[model samples]
Target: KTFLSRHSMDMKFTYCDDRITELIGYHPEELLGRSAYEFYHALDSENMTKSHQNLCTKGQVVSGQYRMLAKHGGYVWLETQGTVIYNPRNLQPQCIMCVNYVLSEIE
Candidate 1:
């Protein structure tokens, strides 16, 4: 029921669910292997980066409002809840699993 996607430690999209299209106009294949940062609105970079760091450090995070570019032209406000999947032995982050919700869409 929610839009879900997974990103590697490098922030490249590894998996994206079909629900992403309904949320952001993106096909799963269009996003796979792409850096999630590329879709972020430039002004929100600092906040989003902080969220990423918090997830890596704290193992989980709920991001504040940030804008992500739609496939066509505009953007949508999103808040992401994310969890870090760690390697058992070293506790190094392996991946980030995100549940994204759209707050609003720009007209």
Candidate 2:
């Protein structure tokens, strides 16, 4: 499954599609205004942190495999790519719009 989300430049979710409920079992309302990083599995944080930095610097990034917490239990493997949305006037990164896909389930 694939779900879309938009985050602030600081990595706080600003928008999430309802499909997220099917992806990781969280409703969009539960995600909005929360840090996307908070859901990351500890072991995958290093890679995602690097990808976050690259997305900020390069205006786009393709993240490697990572894991996210499922609302009910267990974890879900996923890969995500996102682009930086720049402010129209100053061209500074204002947001990141990510499209995430489920790769596998841990259990």
Candidate 3:
């Protein structure tokens, strides 16, 4: 499935799926109104911001490895793939969809 929401004003999680809960420990309900960055570990948050900034280039897929805070306690190391989509009318940057995969547990 795809993740979607507004991007310019702020990065938010409007809709998240069960995989997030299972993987990160937060039910979608708990994360609905939070800034997506709230879940990022303090140390790696800036790195992700830098990575996200690089997404402004058209047709680019950028990725960064970072740690996200789980609902329970510790952090989860994950790598995110980000892409940008423009508004069909204005052709301006619209939303940035990030797809993340767990990169710590198995390895």
Candidate 4:
């Protein structure tokens, strides 16, 4: 069922689509391996910091509402659900998976 939500990708991208570009002005390739800090509103960093902290201890976090800096200028709103997956052996972060969506996209 396709509602007003639920959204794609490449090998390097894993999962990316045009909405990201429209939201943040970064092609998926441009976004890969970039500091999220570079794309966050300074005032909102605290929320993300706490989320990352939680991921380290609890292995997951949720952001009811968050803001990210667009590549050129201004900010975009997002709601995020994030998790850290640990490597089975070393127990290090295998990946930090964040599920994000534009708040405007809400139906």
Candidate topping TM-score: 2
Q: Residue 79: error of model 4 in Å? A: 0.5
Ranking by lDDT: 2, 1, 3, 4
Per-residue lDDT of candidate 2, residues 1-107 (tens digit): 78887889568779888988887788899888787778766777788778888888998888866777778655678788888889999867888888887788654
Worst 10 residues of 3 by lDDT: 1-10
| Model 4 C-alpha lDDT per residue in residues 19-97, reported as the tens digit of each score | 6776666776665655555555678888877766775678666776766667666666678776666679986666666
Segments in model 4 whose C-alpha atoms lie over 4 Å from true places? 1-18, 105-107
Error of 2 at 54 (Å): 1.1
Model 1 steric clash pairs? none
Tens-place lDDT digits, model 1, residues 1-107: 46887989578789998988887788998888888888766777788788887778888889976777778766677778999888899867788889987677653
By lDDT, the better pick of 2 and 4 is 2
Candidate 2 has a TM-score of: 0.88
lDDT of 3 at 12: 68
Task: Return the candidate ranking by TM-score, descending.
Answer: 2, 1, 3, 4
**Lowest-sum lDDT 10-residue window in model 1:** 98-107
What's the lDDT of the predicted structure labeled candidate 4?
Answer: 0.57
- Candidate 2 Cα errors over 4 Å, as ranges: none
